[PDB]
Amino acid sequence: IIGGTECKPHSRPYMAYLEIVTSNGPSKFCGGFLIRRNFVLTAAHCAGRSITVTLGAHNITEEEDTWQKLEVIKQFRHPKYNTSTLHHDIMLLKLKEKASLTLAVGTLGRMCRVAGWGRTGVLKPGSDTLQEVKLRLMDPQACSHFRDFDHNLQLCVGNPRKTKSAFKGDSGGPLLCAGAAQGIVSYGRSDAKPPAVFTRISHYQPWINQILQAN
Ligand SMILES: Cc1c(Cn2c(=O)c(C(=O)O)cn(-c3ccc4c(c3)n(C)c(=O)n4C)c2=O)cccc1C(F)(F)F
Ligand SMILES: *[C@@H]1O[C@H](CO)[C@@H](O[C@@H]2O[C@H](CO)[C@@H](O)[C@H](O)[C@H]2NC(C)=O)[C@H](O)[C@H]1NC(C)=O
Ligand SMILES: *[C@@H]1O[C@H](CO)[C@@H](O[C@@H]2O[C@H](CO)[C@@H](O)[C@H](O)[C@H]2NC(C)=O)[C@H](O)[C@H]1NC(C)=O
Ligand SMILES: [Zn+2]
């Protein structure tokens, strides 16, 4: 998160920190959010050979009693996900067991909010703490330069006259507008100039329900 502020610890108890393993590189990291006690929603580009989810985190460097580190048994990447266009950048992770509900862990032109442990600048490392930024939902014309952006599938997020933005490592986290999840961090410019592209969750609700009912 660029231009955000550190959250009060555990103030976003649905937030999930993902560590993604690949067979041919080191760990990669994403966000996500707990939508059922045994399901996490995130971005399809966060898929890997294996994933561990950490719920209840604030400072991801300092293990504490709120932590619940949970195995993912199965990854459900949207079947039309496209690795070039990042159309349909959405994925459900089924956890091996249902999470415990605690104070720190629970399920989930207007201004929306996005939180994450990602980089705090183009050349800065990922944040040790959960950060949150308020971003403006933009008309789709603001994202035209993203040639594969589609207004029906995606949201256009972030005033280009502000530096505020999600960035690397924030992929998969939710954009909340009026306390409801509307977007998923997907992609943007390498130089972090807003706006960025989010997955429009509403489009995918039938697919989400289909997976949840079959698993
Ligand atoms: C995740 C992210 C990123 C990361 N990022 C890169 O850093 C990056 C690079 O080259 O280093 C490239 N991409 C990329 C990924 C996909 C892209 C695409 C660009 N463009 C321009 C495009 O049309 N597609 C489909 C990235 O998404 C940048 C800005 C914002 C955000 C977000 F959090 F807001 F989503
Ligand atoms: C997040 O937690 C880590 C671990 O407690 C903190 O890292 C310590 O930070 C101090 C000074 O910032 C260093 O001198 C120590 O060496 C660090 N310890 C370890 C184990 O690396 C970090 O400051 C915390 N970040 C917060 C709360 O913002
Ligand atoms: C991912 O999306 C790309 C971009 O649309 C697809 O590539 C296009 O596929 C159509 C249909 O085969 C062709 O007519 C275009 O020429 C292709 N364009 C490019 C730039 O290659 C691609 O097929 C998709 N991949 C998957 C597996 O979904
Ligand atoms: Zn704590």
Curated annotation (Swiss-Prot):
Disulfide bonds join 30-46, 112-177, 143-156. It is found in: Secreted; Cytoplasmic granule. InterPro entries: Peptidase_S1_PA, Peptidase_S1_PA_chymotrypsin, Peptidase_S1A, Trypsin_dom, TRYPSIN_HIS, TRYPSIN_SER. Glycans are attached at residues 59, 82. Residues 1-213 form the Peptidase S1 domain. Its EC number is 3.4.21.39. GO terms for biological process: angiotensin maturation; basement membrane disassembly; cellular response to glucose stimulus; cytokine precursor processing; extracellular matrix disassembly; midbrain development; peptide metabolic process; positive regulation of angiogenesis. The active site is at residues 45, 89, 171. One of its GO terms (cellular component) is extracellular region. Keywords: Disulfide bond, Glycoprotein, Hydrolase, Protease, Secreted, Serine protease, Signal, Zymogen. One of its GO terms (molecular function) is serine-type endopeptidase activity. Mast cells in lung, heart, skin and placenta. Expressed in both normal skin and in urticaria pigmentosa lesions. It catalyses: Preferential cleavage: Phe-|-Xaa > Tyr-|-Xaa > Trp-|-Xaa > Leu-|-Xaa. Pfam families: Trypsin. Major secreted protease of mast cells with suspected roles in vasoactive peptide generation, extracellular matrix degradation, and regulation of gland secretion. Belongs to the peptidase S1 family. Granzyme subfamily. This is Chymase. It comes from Homo sapiens. The lineage of its organism: Eukaryota, Metazoa, Chordata, Craniata, Vertebrata.
